[PDB]
C-alpha cells in the first residue's frame, strides 16, 4: 500500500463496477493505472441478461447523424474504460487528465508482462460474490456483441503463459539454489532471535 508510479492490475476474476470504482478513485488521486487482461473481467448477472443490457446500450443513437450519435465500444478494455469514465468528472480538466492516467489493454502486452501485477480484493468475484450466483465474462459478451479479436488474444495469451511458465521455472530453480544456501549460511541460525 505505497504510492507507485504505475500500478498494473491483472483484471482476471474482478468485478467490472468494483474495479472501475477503485481505479477511478486512484486516478483522481494521481496514479497511473494499467489494467491488463480485460477479457477476464466478471460481471454479476447471467450472460443473457448482460447481453440484453449491452444490446439495449446499442439502441441509444442519434436520429440525425449517428456518426455524432453514441459511440458503442465493443472491446473489453473499452468497456472497462466506459465504466471507469462514467465514475469520473470527465467534463472538467481534472477528470480529463485523470482519464489520460489510465491504460486499459487486451491481454498483457510485452511492456507489461515482465512487471508485477497486483490485484484488488475489493473487486474480486471470489471474495465478493455469493457462491451459486450466475455471472458473465466481458471477453465473452464482447465476442457476441461485435468484438472480433478474441482468437488472436487467446493465442497470444497461450504463448505468454508458456513463456512465463518457463521463466518462473528458471527463477524457481535459482531461488531453490539460494534457498538451499540459506540455512547453510550460519548467521541465519546463530543470531536469529530477532525473528528473521
Amino acid at each position: 500500500s505505497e504510492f507507485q508510479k504505475v500500478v498494473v492490475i491483472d483484471a482476471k476474476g474482478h468485478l467490472l463496477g468494483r474495479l472501475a470504482s477503485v481505479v477511478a478513485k486512484q486516478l483522481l488521486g494521481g496514479q497511473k493505472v494499467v489494467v491488463v487482461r480485460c477479457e477476464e473481467l466478471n460481471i454479476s448477472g447471467h450472460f443473457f441478461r448482460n447481453k440484453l443490457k449491452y444490446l439495449a446500450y446499442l439502441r441509444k443513437a442519434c436520429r440525425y447523424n449517428p456518426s455524432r450519435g453514441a459511440f458503442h465500444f465493443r472491446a473489453p478494455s473499452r468497456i472497462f474504460q466506459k465504466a471507469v469514465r462514467g465514475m469520473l468528472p470527465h467534463k472538467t480538466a481534472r477528470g480529463q487528465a485523470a482519464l489520460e492516467h489510465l491504460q486499459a489493454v487486451e491481454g498483457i502486452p510485452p511492456p507489461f508482462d515482465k512487471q508485477k501485477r497486483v490485484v484488488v480484493p475489493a473487486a474480486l468475484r471470489v471474495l465478493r460474490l455469493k457462491p451459486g450466483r450466475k455471472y458473465c465474462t466481458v471477453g465473452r459478451l464482447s465476442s457476441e456483441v461485435g468484438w472480433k479479436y478474441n482468437d488472436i488474444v487467446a493465442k497470444l495469451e497461450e504463448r505468454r503463459k508458456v513463456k512465463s511458465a518457463a521463466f518462473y521455472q528458471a527463477k524457481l530453480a535459482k531461488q531453490k539454489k539460494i534457498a538451499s544456501a540459506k540455512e547453510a549460511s550460519p548467521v541465519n541460525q546463530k543470531l536469529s532471535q530477532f525473528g528473521y
Binding site: 441478461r49 440484453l52 443490457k53 449491452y54 439495449a56 446500450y57
Partner: peptide, 30 residues
C-alpha cells in the same frame, strides 16, 4: 442500462399528485 420499457424515475407533477389523491382516498374511505 435501464433495460426497461417504462422509466423508473417519476416527474414532479406525478409524484406530487400521489400525495394529492392518496390523501383524498383516505378521506373517501373515512
Amino acid at each position: 442500462v435501464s433495460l426497461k420499457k417504462k422509466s423508473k424515475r417519476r416527474t414532479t407533477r406525478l409524484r406530487s399528485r400521489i400525495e394529492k389523491k392518496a390523501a383524498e382516498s383516505k378521506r373517501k374511505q373515512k
